[PDB]
Amino acid sequence: MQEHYQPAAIEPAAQKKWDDARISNVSEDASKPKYYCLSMFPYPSGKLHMGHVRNYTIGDVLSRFKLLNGFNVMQPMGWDAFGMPAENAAMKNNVAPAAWTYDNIEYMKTQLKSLGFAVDWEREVATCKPEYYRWEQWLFTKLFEKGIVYRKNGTVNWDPVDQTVLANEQVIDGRGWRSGALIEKREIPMYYFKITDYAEELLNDLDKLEHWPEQVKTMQRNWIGKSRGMTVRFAVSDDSKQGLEGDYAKFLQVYTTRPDTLMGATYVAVAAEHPLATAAAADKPELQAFIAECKAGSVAEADMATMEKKGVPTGRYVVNPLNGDKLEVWIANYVLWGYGDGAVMAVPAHDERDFEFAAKYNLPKKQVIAVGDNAFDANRWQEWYGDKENGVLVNSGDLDGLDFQTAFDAVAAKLQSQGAGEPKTQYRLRDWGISRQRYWGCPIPIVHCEKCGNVPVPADQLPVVLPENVVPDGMGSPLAKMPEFYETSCPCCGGAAKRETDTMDTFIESSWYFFRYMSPKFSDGMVSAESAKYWGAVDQYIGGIEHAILHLLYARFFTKLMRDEGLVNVDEPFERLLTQGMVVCETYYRENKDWINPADVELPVSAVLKADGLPVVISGTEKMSKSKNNGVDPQELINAYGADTARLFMMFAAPPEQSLEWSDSGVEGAHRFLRRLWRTVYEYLKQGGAVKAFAGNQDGLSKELKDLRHKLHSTTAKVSDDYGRRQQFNTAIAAVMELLNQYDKTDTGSEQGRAVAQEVLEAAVRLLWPIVPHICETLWSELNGAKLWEAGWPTVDEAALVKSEIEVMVQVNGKLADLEAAALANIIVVPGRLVNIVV
């Protein structure tokens, strides 16, 4: 055994030992309990970053833990290859996105193999290969003829300079981020997944996810946004019907989730595209400018509540069908045309948004809800104004005294009696638009024929291969400029036809890749029936919190779609979910700001550039990114200390949910502990060699060795509970360090002492194997000759936890240090089990 810990010597040999044994290459063996541990597969951006290393180390710790407990563990890896990154690097390097993608895949695959992740590389997938996306094109065609996928016109943001479509997140003050030109709003036909049909199922099945973070389930419920409200129709006053036609001349229909406060409505608001706004603005220039300003907006839901709400009166009036109050209609900028009826009512006394809106324009506030003896200040909002559970109605006529639910049915009864309204259920969830005007993506299997219409590609002709011999210039979608691609024949009549040049949303490939891992070479479907029946669903899922809404909701949606097609048998894809925190680092620059990467900086007084001696400016600590040039390359971390030191540093610096801060001193400490672990096993084997680990009746051991066995098996139970239940790996590392400290302070020189020392070391290297498997595999082969994965997870000897009982009999006046203070708690004693009290 080498005296000093050398990572570059043991890590390749340990990885070769694991590959030759094929411990990670698992199949559908029905003679062993399966476990599907999955980490979110990465974009082949070029090289790994610290966020990747943390995620896949967390997944490998859990996978190796289940592996040591006898599970048939599958930990697959893959590449989310489609997207704008490859298209942007194409425009900057004059290289095809496919060639740029495949080079990154082979390089990042080399890095992942260097870290020693126990993954099944025989199940590797790449979403940009036709062997993969042929099946999402297949599901598209099946759902297209079923109506789940449909095609209709949708409004997009067009940049007339960059010649591309931009999202609302890419529109600043109505202009593009790169071009800076005023964006144009055009209606173009696009494809949609009718996800609203599964809205109630996607909402209620969240309750099954008992091992999901409650904030993630809460984030999905709010995004779905189911509300059980009331449709209310306000009769248009006879003096306000000019310019209106049809039902819009009869009434103004709104939707509200608080019909118990209908008596408190002081005004109503419509959208800019509402016919009431159109008729009222026909002769008012100030309203036409307000309607044009609303239509030219681009407020995303990530900041639609931070939008400055504003409105303008119209002069038209409607009638409240429950008290006769003549209410004026306003044009508001928060009423969205397409949500409900494009019109709402406002109760400023019990809705915080209507409160601020009314206080802005000095609009009346009518209290109709009272919660106890709480005072009502009309010039100050209080949280009890919007209470529903503990409130009764006031100033509501014959509705006073009722709570929320009874007044809900009471208002519904009156509205349905006169035909002025009825209950209704709605959802904030919109349909999923999947059309993208880019090249580097999965083609949409639709052929356009002027005789047959929008026709899906037959199953025999799939896939519609995306040509990889393309270098996008940027003046539009390259597929739209390639007649060799889109010109084809119609699959129904055989005449001249054009292919769909748009590609699919890249979230589609990540919505089902967890099923493809079960049979990534199955040529007859998305997933074979025998594999999906065996592996079932994903037991453990690890990924960042940024995907807690869209990606997870899309995966649950696709799971139910595939289930209803007889492909899979599960209702949910992910049983357990672990969201990892971000990785932050300090930033440095040199003004002239010119941010410098920390790997080239040398420092507690100040810091300076490693290339010379020019002092740098230390700035704030932020998440690692290319914005402030504070990303620390993980490859340099491996080249300096080895893979085990990197894994150990990330699992010990912070719990997985908590954000990890980069620290050069912390990396040195992790490497220093690995030296200590190596030195400990070496010094033990030098003074005698390996022996048989202690086992059996511990009675007869010294008090010192009994305490070391107590600390040992309590540490095993602590680590086992930290891996299985809490999933808090930094505390498990601390527990093993505490065991080694007591080992250092224990005389293990005797024959029975060596046996306990062997039991301590054989357990410590196995408890730390899921975290640092390279050095643990090497140290285990020096202490024991058997296979580590065949020895299994260390068992807890509960006999070593039961402490010795101090039993004796007390005696006061004849009849019935350490033992005297306990007896006096309830005069010389006998050194044994007898204490006499001379009173």
Ligand X SMILES: CC(C)C[C@H](N)C(=O)NS(=O)(=O)OC[C@H]1OC[C@@H](CCCn2cc(CNCc3ccccc3)nn2)[C@H](O)[C@@H]1O
Q: Which stretch binds Zn ion (CB under 5 A): 35-43, 138-146, 488-496, 608-616?
A: 488-496
Q: Are 339 and 429 in contact (CB under 8 A)?
A: no
CA distances from residue 771 to 488, 659, 776 in whole angstroms, order as listed: 55, 19, 9
Judging by beta carbons within 10 Å of its beta carbon (0-12, 13-18, 19+), is residue 634 exposed, middle or buried? buried
Instruction: Answer yes or no whether residue 479 interacts with ligand X by CB under 6 A.
Output: no
Instruction: Give 46 or 669: the residue with its C-beta nearer to ligand X.
Output: 46
- Nearest approach, Cβ of residue 84 and ligand X (Å): 7
For the chain, report the end-to-end CA distance as a whole number of angstroms. Answer: 66
Sequence-distant (≥ 6) Cβ neighbours of residue 716 within 8 angstroms: 763, 767, 794, 795, 796
What type of residue sits at position 379? N
Instruction: Answer yes or no whether residue 436 interacts with ligand X by CB under 6 A.
Output: no
Q: Considering CB distances under 5 to 8 angstroms, the limit depending on partner class, which of Zn ion, ligand X, none binds residue 672?
A: none
Q: Considering CB distances under 5 to 8 angstroms, the limit depending on partner class, which of Zn ion, ligand X, none binds residue 543?
A: ligand X
Instruction: Give 85 or 311: the residue with its C-beta nearer to ligand X.
Output: 85
Q: Which stretch binds Zn ion (CB under 5 A): 493-501, 508-516, 727-735, 747-755?
A: 493-501
Residues touching ligand X: how many (CB under 6 A)?
A: 17
Closest CA to 261 of 221, 218, 229: 229
User: Strand, coil or helix: what is 803?
Assistant: coil
Instruction: Give 449 or 653: the residue with its C-beta nearer to Zn ion.
Output: 449
User: Strand, coil or helix: what is 702?
Assistant: coil
Backbone angles phi, psi at 811, to 5 degrees: -150, 125
Instruction: Give 39 or 367: the residue with its C-beta nearer to ligand X.
Output: 39
Closest CA to 647 of 2, 4, 14: 14
Q: Which residue is nearest to Zn ion (CB)?
A: 490
Among residues 60, 68, 75, 80, the one that binds ligand X under rule CB under 6 A: 80
Q: Are 780 and 766 in contact (CB under 8 A)?
A: yes
Q: Are 358 and 364 in contact (CB under 8 A)?
A: yes
Rule CB under 6 A: which of 555-594 touch ligand X? 582
Query: In the structure encoding, which two tokens stand for residue 821, read together?
Result: 């203070």
- Nearest approach, Cβ of residue 501 and Zn ion (Å): 18
Q: Which residue is nearest to ligand X (CB)?
A: 544
Q: Which residue has the tokens 């020895």?
A: 791
| Omega before residue 85 within 30° of 0, cis | no
Among residues 307, 475, 493, 830, the one that binds Zn ion under rule CB under 5 A: 493
122-154 burial, b if ≥16 CB within 10 A, otherwise e?
Answer: ebbbbbbeeebbbbbbbbbbebbeeebbebeee
User: Strand, coil or helix: what is 234?
Assistant: strand
Residues touching Zn ion: how many (CB under 5 A)?
A: 6
Q: Considering CB distances under 5 to 8 angstroms, the limit depending on partner class, which of ligand X, Zn ion, none binds residue 490?
A: Zn ion
HSE-up of 338 (CA within 13 Å, CB side)? 8
Q: Are 758 and 692 in contact (CB under 8 A)?
A: yes
Closest CA to 7 of 632, 648, 602, 651: 648
Q: Considering CB distances under 5 to 8 angstroms, the limit depending on partner class, which of Zn ion, ligand X, none binds residue 433?
A: none
Q: Which stretch binds Zn ion (CB under 5 A): 447-455, 607-615, 718-726, 771-779?
A: 447-455
How far is the C-alpha of 465 from the C-alpha of 443, rounded, in Å? 7
Among residues 299, 378, 452, 480, the one that binds Zn ion under rule CB under 5 A: 452
How far is the C-alpha of 604 from the C-alpha of 17, rounded, in Å? 44
Among residues 546, 602, 683, 820, the one that binds ligand X under rule CB under 6 A: 546
| Omega before residue 598 within 30° of 0, cis | no
User: Strand, coil or helix: what is 337?
Assistant: coil
Instruction: Answer yes or no whether residue 490 interacts with Zn ion by CB under 5 A.
Output: yes
Query: In the structure encoding, which two tokens stand for residue 692, read together?
Result: 């048989």
Instruction: Give 52 or 365: the residue with its C-beta nearer to ligand X.
Output: 52
Q: Which stretch binds Zn ion (CB under 5 A): 79-87, 445-453, 560-568, 575-583?
A: 445-453
Instruction: Give 451 or 590: the residue with its C-beta nearer to Zn ion.
Output: 451
Among residues 243, 433, 544, 666, the one that binds ligand X under rule CB under 6 A: 544
Residues 43-62: x/- map of binding to ligand X (CB under 6 A)?
x-x-----xx--x-------
Neighbours of 70 (CB within 10 A): 14
Instruction: Give 141 or 629: the residue with its C-beta nearer to Zn ion.
Output: 141
Q: Which stretch binds Zn ion (CB under 5 A): 135-143, 483-491, 524-532, 694-702?
A: 483-491
Instruction: Answer yes or no whether residue 40 interacts with ligand X by CB under 6 A.
Output: yes
Q: Which stretch binds ligand X (CB under 6 A): 144-152, 161-169, 544-552, 670-678?
A: 544-552
Instruction: Answer yes or no whether residue 58 interacts with Zn ion by CB under 5 A.
Output: no
Q: Considering CB distances under 5 to 8 angstroms, the limit depending on partner class, which of Zn ion, ligand X, none binds residue 404?
A: none
Which residues of this chain interact with ligand X, rule CB under 6 A?
A: 40-43, 45, 51-52, 55, 80, 85, 510, 543-544, 546-547, 551, 582
Which residues of this chain interact with Zn ion, rule CB under 5 A?
A: 449, 451-452, 490, 492-493
